[PDB]
Amino acid sequence: DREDDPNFFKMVEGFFDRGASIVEDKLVEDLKTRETEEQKRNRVRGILRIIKPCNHVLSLSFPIRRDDGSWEVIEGYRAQHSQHRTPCKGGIRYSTDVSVDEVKALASLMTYKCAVVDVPFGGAKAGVKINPKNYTDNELEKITRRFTMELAKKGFIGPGVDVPAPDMSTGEREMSWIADTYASTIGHYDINAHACVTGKPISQGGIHGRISATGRGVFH
Amino acid sequence: DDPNFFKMVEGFFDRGASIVEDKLVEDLKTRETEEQKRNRVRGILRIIKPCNHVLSLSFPIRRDDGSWEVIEGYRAQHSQHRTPCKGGIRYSTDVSVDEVKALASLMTYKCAVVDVPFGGAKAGVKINPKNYTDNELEKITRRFTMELAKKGFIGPGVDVPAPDMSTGEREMSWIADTYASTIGHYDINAHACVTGKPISQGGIHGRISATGRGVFHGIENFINEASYMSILGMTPGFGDKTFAVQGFGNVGLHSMRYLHRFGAKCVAVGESDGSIWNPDGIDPKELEDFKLQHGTILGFPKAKIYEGSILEVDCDILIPAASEKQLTKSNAPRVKAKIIAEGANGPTTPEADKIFLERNIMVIPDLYLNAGGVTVSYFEWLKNLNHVSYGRLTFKYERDSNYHLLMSVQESLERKFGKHGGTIPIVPTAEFQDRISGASEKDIVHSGLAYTMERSARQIMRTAMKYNLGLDLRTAAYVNAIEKVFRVYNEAGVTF
Amino acid sequence: PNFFKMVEGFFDRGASIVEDKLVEDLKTRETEEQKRNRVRGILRIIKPCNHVLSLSFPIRRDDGSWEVIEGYRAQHSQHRTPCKGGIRYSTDVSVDEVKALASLMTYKCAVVDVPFGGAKAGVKINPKNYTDNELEKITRRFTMELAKKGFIGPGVDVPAPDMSTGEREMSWIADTYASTIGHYDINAHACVTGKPISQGGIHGRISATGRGVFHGIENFINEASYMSILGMTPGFGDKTFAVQGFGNVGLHSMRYLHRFGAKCVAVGESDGSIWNPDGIDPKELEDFKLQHGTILGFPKAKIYEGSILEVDCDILIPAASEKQLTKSNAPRVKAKIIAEGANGPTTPEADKIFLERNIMVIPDLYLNAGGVTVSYFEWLKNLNHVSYGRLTFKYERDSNYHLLMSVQESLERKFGKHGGTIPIVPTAEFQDRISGASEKDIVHSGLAYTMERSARQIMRTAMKYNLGLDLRTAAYVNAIEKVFRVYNEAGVTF
Amino acid sequence: DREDDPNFFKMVEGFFDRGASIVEDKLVEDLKTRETEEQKRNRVRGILRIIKPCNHVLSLSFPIRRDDGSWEVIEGYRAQHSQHRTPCKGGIRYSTDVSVDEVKALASLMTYKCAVVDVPFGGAKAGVKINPKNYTDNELEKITRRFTMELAKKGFIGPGVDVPAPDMSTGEREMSWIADTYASTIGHYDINAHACVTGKPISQGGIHGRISATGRGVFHGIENFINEASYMSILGMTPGFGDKTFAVQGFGNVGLHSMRYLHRFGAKCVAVGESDGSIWNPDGIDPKELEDFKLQHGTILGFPKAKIYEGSILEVDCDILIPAASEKQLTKSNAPRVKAKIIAEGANGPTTPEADKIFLERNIMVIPDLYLNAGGVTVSYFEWLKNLNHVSYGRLTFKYERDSNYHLLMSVQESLERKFGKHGGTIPIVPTAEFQDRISGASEKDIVHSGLAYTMERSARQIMRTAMKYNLGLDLRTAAYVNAIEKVFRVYNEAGVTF
Ligand SMILES: Nc1ncnc2c1ncn2[C@@H]1O[C@H](COP(=O)(O)OP(=O)(O)O)[C@@H](O)[C@H]1O
Ligand SMILES: Nc1ncnc2c1ncn2[C@@H]1O[C@H](COP(=O)(O)OP(=O)(O)O)[C@@H](O)[C@H]1O
Ligand SMILES: Nc1ncnc2c1ncn2[C@@H]1O[C@H](COP(=O)(O)OP(=O)(O)O)[C@@H](O)[C@H]1O
Ligand SMILES: Nc1ncnc2c1ncn2[C@@H]1O[C@H](COP(=O)(O)OP(=O)(O)O)[C@@H](O)[C@H]1O
Ligand SMILES: CC(C)C[C@H](N)C(=O)O
Ligand SMILES: CC(C)C[C@H](N)C(=O)O
Ligand SMILES: CC(C)C[C@H](N)C(=O)O
Ligand SMILES: [K+]
Numbered sequence A: 001d002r003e004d005d006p007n008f009f010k011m012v013e014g015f016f017d018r019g020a021s022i023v024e025d026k027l028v029e030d031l032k033t034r035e036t037e038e039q040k041r042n043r044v045r046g047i048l049r050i051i052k053p054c055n056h057v058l059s060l061s062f063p064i065r066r067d068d069g070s071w072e073v074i075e076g077y078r079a080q081h082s083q084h085r086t087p088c089k090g091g092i093r094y095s096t097d098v099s100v101d102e103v104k105a106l107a108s109l110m111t112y113k114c115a116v117v118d119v120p121f122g123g124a125k126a127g128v129k130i131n132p133k134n135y136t137d138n139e140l141e142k143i144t145r146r147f148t149m150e151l152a153k154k155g156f157i158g159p160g161v162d163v164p165a166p167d168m169s170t171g172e173r174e175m176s177w178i179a180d181t182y183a184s185t186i187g188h189y190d191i192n193a194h195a196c197v198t199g200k201p202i203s204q205g206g207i208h209g210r211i212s213a214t215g216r217g218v219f220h
Numbered sequence B: 001d002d003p004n005f006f007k008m009v010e011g012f013f014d015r016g017a018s019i020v021e022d023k024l025v026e027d028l029k030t031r032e033t034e035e036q037k038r039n040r041v042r043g044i045l046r047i048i049k050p051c052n053h054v055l056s057l058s059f060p061i062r063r064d065d066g067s068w069e070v071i072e073g074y075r076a077q078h079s080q081h082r083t084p085c086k087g088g089i090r091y092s093t094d095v096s097v098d099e100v101k102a103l104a105s106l107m108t109y110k111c112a113v114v115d116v117p118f119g120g121a122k123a124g125v126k127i128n129p130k131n132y133t134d135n136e137l138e139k140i141t142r143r144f145t146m147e148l149a150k151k152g153f154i155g156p157g158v159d160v161p162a163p164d165m166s167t168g169e170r171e172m173s174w175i176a177d178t179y180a181s182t183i184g185h186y187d188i189n190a191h192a193c194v195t196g197k198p199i200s201q202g203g204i205h206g207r208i209s210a211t212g213r214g215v216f217h218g219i220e221n222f223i224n225e226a227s228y229m230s231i232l233g234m235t236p237g238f239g240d241k242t243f244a245v246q247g248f249g250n251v252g253l254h255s256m257r258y259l260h261r262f263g264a265k266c267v268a269v270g271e272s273d274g275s276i277w278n279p280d281g282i283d284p285k286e287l288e289d290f291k292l293q294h295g296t297i298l299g300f301p302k303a304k305i306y307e308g309s310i311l312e313v314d315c316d317i318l319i320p321a322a323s324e325k326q327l328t329k330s331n332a333p334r335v336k337a338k339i340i341a342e343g344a345n346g347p348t349t350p351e352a353d354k355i356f357l358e359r360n361i362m363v364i365p366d367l368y369l370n371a372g373g374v375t376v377s378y379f380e381w382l383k384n385l386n387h388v389s390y391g392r393l394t395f396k397y398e399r400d401s402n403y404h405l406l407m408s409v410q411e412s413l414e415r416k417f418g419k420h421g422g423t424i425p426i427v428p429t430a431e432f433q434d435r436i437s438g439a440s441e442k443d444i445v446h447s448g449l450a451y452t453m454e455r456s457a458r459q460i461m462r463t464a465m466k467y468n469l470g471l472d473l474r475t476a477a478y479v480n481a482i483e484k485v486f487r488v489y490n491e492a493g494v495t496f
Numbered sequence C: 001p002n003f004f005k006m007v008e009g010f011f012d013r014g015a016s017i018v019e020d021k022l023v024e025d026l027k028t029r030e031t032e033e034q035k036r037n038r039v040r041g042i043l044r045i046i047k048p049c050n051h052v053l054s055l056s057f058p059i060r061r062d063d064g065s066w067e068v069i070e071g072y073r074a075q076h077s078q079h080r081t082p083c084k085g086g087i088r089y090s091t092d093v094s095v096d097e098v099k100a101l102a103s104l105m106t107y108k109c110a111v112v113d114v115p116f117g118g119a120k121a122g123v124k125i126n127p128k129n130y131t132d133n134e135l136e137k138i139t140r141r142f143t144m145e146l147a148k149k150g151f152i153g154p155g156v157d158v159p160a161p162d163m164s165t166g167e168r169e170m171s172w173i174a175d176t177y178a179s180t181i182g183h184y185d186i187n188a189h190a191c192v193t194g195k196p197i198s199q200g201g202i203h204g205r206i207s208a209t210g211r212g213v214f215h216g217i218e219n220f221i222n223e224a225s226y227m228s229i230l231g232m233t234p235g236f237g238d239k240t241f242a243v244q245g246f247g248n249v250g251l252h253s254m255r256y257l258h259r260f261g262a263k264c265v266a267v268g269e270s271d272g273s274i275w276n277p278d279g280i281d282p283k284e285l286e287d288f289k290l291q292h293g294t295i296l297g298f299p300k301a302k303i304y305e306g307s308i309l310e311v312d313c314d315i316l317i318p319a320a321s322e323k324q325l326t327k328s329n330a331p332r333v334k335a336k337i338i339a340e341g342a343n344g345p346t347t348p349e350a351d352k353i354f355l356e357r358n359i360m361v362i363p364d365l366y367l368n369a370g371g372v373t374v375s376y377f378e379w380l381k382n383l384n385h386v387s388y389g390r391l392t393f394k395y396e397r398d399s400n401y402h403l404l405m406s407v408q409e410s411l412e413r414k415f416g417k418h419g420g421t422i423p424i425v426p427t428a429e430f431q432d433r434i435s436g437a438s439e440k441d442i443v444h445s446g447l448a449y450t451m452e453r454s455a456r457q458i459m460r461t462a463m464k465y466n467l468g469l470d471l472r473t474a475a476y477v478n479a480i481e482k483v484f485r486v487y488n489e490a491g492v493t494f
Numbered sequence D: 001d002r003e004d005d006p007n008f009f010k011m012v013e014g015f016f017d018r019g020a021s022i023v024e025d026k027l028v029e030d031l032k033t034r035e036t037e038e039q040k041r042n043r044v045r046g047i048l049r050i051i052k053p054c055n056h057v058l059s060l061s062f063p064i065r066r067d068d069g070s071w072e073v074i075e076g077y078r079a080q081h082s083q084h085r086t087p088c089k090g091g092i093r094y095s096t097d098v099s100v101d102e103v104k105a106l107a108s109l110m111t112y113k114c115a116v117v118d119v120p121f122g123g124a125k126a127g128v129k130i131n132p133k134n135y136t137d138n139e140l141e142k143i144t145r146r147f148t149m150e151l152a153k154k155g156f157i158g159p160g161v162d163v164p165a166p167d168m169s170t171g172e173r174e175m176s177w178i179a180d181t182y183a184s185t186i187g188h189y190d191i192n193a194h195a196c197v198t199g200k201p202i203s204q205g206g207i208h209g210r211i212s213a214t215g216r217g218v219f220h221g222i223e224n225f226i227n228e229a230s231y232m233s234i235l236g237m238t239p240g241f242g243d244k245t246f247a248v249q250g251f252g253n254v255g256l257h258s259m260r261y262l263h264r265f266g267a268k269c270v271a272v273g274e275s276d277g278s279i280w281n282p283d284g285i286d287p288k289e290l291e292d293f294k295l296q297h298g299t300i301l302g303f304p305k306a307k308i309y310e311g312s313i314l315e316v317d318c319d320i321l322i323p324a325a326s327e328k329q330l331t332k333s334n335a336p337r338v339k340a341k342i343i344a345e346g347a348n349g350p351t352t353p354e355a356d357k358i359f360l361e362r363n364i365m366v367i368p369d370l371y372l373n374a375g376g377v378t379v380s381y382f383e384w385l386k387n388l389n390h391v392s393y394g395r396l397t398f399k400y401e402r403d404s405n406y407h408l409l410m411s412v413q414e415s416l417e418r419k420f421g422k423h424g425g426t427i428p429i430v431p432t433a434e435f436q437d438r439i440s441g442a443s444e445k446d447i448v449h450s451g452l453a454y455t456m457e458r459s460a461r462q463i464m465r466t467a468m469k470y471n472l473g474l475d476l477r478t479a480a481y482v483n484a485i486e487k488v489f490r491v492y493n494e495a496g497v498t499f
């Protein structure tokens, strides 16, 4: 789909570059500080250069044991575009078409998407390079739980660090397994352990009105 | 030739994994069918091959002139079968994800052959240190440490970085100080988060000489073995042995100094810009003093200027202590040396390795020979966990026991023979007296390295005989490492 | 002069001496004025206490009434963590006293290469006015208040006992920490030193300061270079000494010097003095003081009217009280060596007179660091979670036996069937060492190695800066040089 | 200023001693326990002995590298008076006049200030011994960041341990640097890391209504007593702000807002005083006109619609005198000349205890600083809560409330239209212009204002009830300290003391 298209990653980068050059001159004159005019230009342009790229990108290679007994090494990625607002927020895609560039572009898009709706999260996006159609519900549980463990140990999941969500390829049951693994292992001593992931079922701490949310947003 | 060093390490693993595979299946005693055993072994080897984690960073820095700069950085953790991970930090504009991944994987197997309980890791900050002030380099080092710490890529029990040819002990000190005062403030072992630190910050004595001593002990273990030496048409020991060193750096200088100390004669010393040669012999102390006063070995009074590389010098031992991929298939059939002691990572290409095997030229691999520095970095990590220097509470105790031992021999002999021709004074030799007076931590670190190199040489020799590899010591070393990493995975199991 | 002003003056003197040598030894990309600012700037950071905590905690007396207790704890430096320093229970404790002793501990640890920053606590109470139950409550509550503010922890700050504090207080500090906030710490019991053996204490703690005083004197007395300057022969043979203050330090120092040939001529105390030029036996004097409470009335010694400080001897050891040797009695001291076995027994004005009179004063900074050295070993023992030698005593014994058996089997081959059997067995002294092998032997040797190494460092510093018999200045310069090096190579965060 | 004055430290100690001896006898008889009457006296006096002193005081000496390269060692202090409520709360002062005694006295005062407005924090106060005028913005950032690190490591900063705030000497940019240092270093793993400090900018998690907070508190404090007919008849005055004249001494942030809100409710500003000069007009002074002149010229001197008053505003013939300047201005020498009937302390310690005696003799009601100057403390509690909540106030309920209001109006409209039939036409029930503005402009500040109003209303009644209980009359300061000591005592008595 369009979210996996290289042309869309360049598209988002261009949108940022356009907006940064427009806002630049107004940000310098609005700055009231004890600095020279060249020190103000460096401060504004320096902050814009920090914002543009992804701050962190984690690449994973974790094991899985198939229902038939065979072993498989799974590739995964998670980019955290910005931490100006913590936790980071962003979905998890299960597709063979996921890439580092895709995960970086969608993480950056998330940062600006959150800022326009005053949602206090930095941008993030994960991608597990597998085709869910090739796996059993048991195998998908193993992949989800082990991916959660690898993200948790490296600070890429936690209620105050990074809160993943579903997308077109993941569902509420995968989100439920992510929360369950975190609450029962790394986040056992955390009172807000179930806030490490959103898109959860109602029985697991999900909000009512999640299914209609995007449609109501389009309407409003 | 010029193959990517990343592809080289991958090929070494693939070769070793297929050799060890059949022996790992029959050695497995479990309630499984023979096809279930093949899948379990091949499956664990598929897990070991790739890097488990790779972190890419983009952190800000404010230059001394006030301008801002975004720095790129990477750190790969190849394996966590042994925690913490261990691996250097390179400050170069030529660092890449593939370079950092290949060196991380190489470090896993290098640690495994010398029984150092760490997984492999490697970091790279994409900057040229020559372009930055000491203040700017401090900011880069401190900020990089912060970004690694928050994502679990630095910590005494998680990942312990180290210096490289581009970084030093002052950068290591800033890493330790940033960790100990910010994220690891509450950790009693916060200074064990990084090795290669100065002595004032918790560094081990004997770090500077470590790689050179490891190169010496590695050669020493094979040169004293008469079984291997008779194959190469040589006599055992360093007596009547001539050697040549490619690259006169920290490793080159120390390797030359220790071999010369044991009777070997240095015939030629090569460098990035020019070469030096004297068949009568080159004194390492005289060459060191000239190199420190002039900068280059070119113009040494007791040596003629050699036109060309030192790899094709008529000697017994060739030591490439610098540069990568210097011995290729084009210059391998011209090596007059009989032992090629790899003092650097990846100095010989796999195509040159084939030629050296055909020519019965024993190549002691980098995986084993270049692991002296890794071994004492393990000892530094332990020193910080111990919170005491080695020997601090036992040097005087040992000294008193030694006096009592000699006094017991003296008093026992004086009772057996009497004072017929007087007292029989049993006193320490001049050499033993120097050892007692100069007893310091460095003696224990040197001993620990020597024991590790001796033990690991015999392990590689036994693996070579077990799999009938002969002079293919590199394959023996990778099979030895894969056998050890596999055993940890097989007996621990995989979570979920 | 005040002791708090004294330690400040010692630092200022040492900092100005070491300053010029620190600039030229600095190899960095800076101008000569940038190097002077960096050195002077770092020296300014070291001098004051980094942190000082003042407490006001509640206590309920055994009768039911409530009492608010005052307490303080200063952490002079964190260039080495944890901080280390004792706890004093006295109504005379003050912020300035706690700050001066914390700074003194920084330099004292540095001269003996003990990797701790300086620290000192004081609870403003008179322990004589409280029951053992009330003292337990004060100790536990004080520990809790220190713990919540980062003033106790195995890797943060490790307290120790004082003259007003004992091993039972340390035991309550460790138990309170390990059972409440430090519960999840595997090294919780390493939060305090001076603990009983049953709670994780080292063997050789009681004798530690006395052994340190002995080894400190021993290292200088056996140096012929220094002894010829004082017009004396090297070694303890034909050496006479006098001890002022017959406490734990006084008793042990007297016992160890006597053991090595030195003769005790006089022993002084808070109430009265004892003198016998023929000699005073330390075991006989110890038994009399334990059975009568005081040394006054010792049968083998005449009652000396006055302080022991002016007795005609070779070595004077003030092993108790502060500022006993002052500018008024310094020109009357007959001893050639003054071994400070207590903190600040000689004023800086007396130091000037001793230098003029060629009387070597071994400073408290070095000589009184035996207890600090074994407190480091106790902290290490708790981190190790094992007594010293536990896994190697038997191994070492068997290696010794193999060595002697090898000499025997080799000599029996050389002298064959004529020299019969040649039994190579350990001496009586070596056999006793093997049989009595315990942790105390390793602590004693570890302390002897520290005192030997540190004496040579102070001697080398004295020669480097041409200080001669000014060993106190050599010790402070040695300590400032070490603390500076840690700051210079680590850098300052932000 | 008077918060640096040693006489003010003795004042706060004396206020506590007075309140503790008044509350003592009532605390003994109210105690129902298995103890003798002398055991009850020892328990009450013993707990009050624990409450009086500061529990912890940290003295710091931290390094700083100046922009020229030189090094400087900075002195700093932080006192935590009581932890009967955690976290501790209190500002940070950057002044060369800060001292341990100043930091201890202001820490104790914050314990009792929080207690009267039911803000669940213990008292605390920090002081860095530097003159900010001598440092660059870069140097001040280094000082702020390093000071935060030293406090964090010793438990003197943290969301659940100690939450600092700005002072007159420090601003929102300092607080932002504190929160940023904490969230990036020691508090990195804390989800509430940004709740470690209050007074932060809006972009960093600061509440809307922080700037107006102290002024609204001064207004609501006066409003609660001015509307009470019992107190007003004693002062020979009518209840309400109608026909009420007031004078403000100090045209700062508190002075400007207090003048604006009283004028909005009908009161007439007769005179405004300042550090350099005074302004007076018996016909009235418009706060918006005076604010615009002060912003364009730097001073109120020369205001066209007001004559230049020679002297302090304290003796102007008005009804309400609002000392909004942090100075011991009302002393025993000028207290017998105050023509106002109500003295509203919009600053800490503006009246001396000797002047308090004269005001009681003259039947002049002084609303104390302990209560009236607690508006900013109240919204700092709301800022701390906002950061814990991780959401602005009303974000999920403004639209919900708006829909319910429209349903209530459409119900009245349909109900009436049904009763009078279609013959009586349509009866449109729509919101007033004022209600329509409230609905359209619904934002967080509307809820912060309401929470502050509820707190000031509730606390005024508590002080009034305490005053009647102990027969204090117009001695509202003693009522406020007795109210605060009563609350702190209750926490210690019911929690107990560990060990
Ligand atoms: N993702 C974000 N990145 C940056 N600024 C943000 C982000 N989300 C919100 N903000 C801004 O931060 C401030 C938060 O203030 P607050 O009034 O508490 O928030 P809001 O009213 O938006 O809930 C507002 O200025 C808001 O626009
Ligand atoms: N990096 C490593 N990876 C895997 N196995 C290792 C590694 N280092 C050491 N080992 C193995 O783990 C075991 C550790 O046992 P131990 O006897 O305690 O170690 P050692 O004698 O090597 O110090 C040995 O079999 C050793 O060869
Ligand atoms: N308290 C201290 N402060 C500063 N430096 C110290 C301190 N204690 C020891 N050092 C120094 O730190 C270094 C520690 O190195 P190491 O050889 O491990 O120590 P040591 O041999 O003294 O046990 C030595 O240079 C030592 O002199
Ligand atoms: N700083 C404080 N110190 C002591 N008691 C306090 C403090 N703040 C509030 N209290 C008291 O603690 C109780 C808290 O009960 P609650 O009803 O939750 O509080 P509130 O209604 O005041 O928000 C009340 O009795 C309140 O007066
Ligand atoms: C060898 C072990 C550390 C392996 C670990 N259980 C894993 O799943 O990677
Ligand atoms: C020597 C180091 C512990 C110094 C530390 N970085 C500081 O700023 O105090
Ligand atoms: C009110 C409580 C928090 C008091 C606390 N239990 C103490 O011992 O001081
Ligand atoms: K970014």
Ligand SMILES: [K+]
Pocket (backbone or CB within 6 Å): B047, B048, B049, B050, B051, B052, B078, B079, B080
């Ligand atoms: K792996």
Ligand SMILES: [K+]
Pocket (backbone or CB within 6 Å): C045, C046, C047, C048, C049, C050, C076, C077
């Ligand atoms: K200091």
Ligand SMILES: [K+]
Pocket (backbone or CB within 6 Å): D050, D051, D052, D053, D054, D055, D081, D082, D083
């Ligand atoms: K209190």
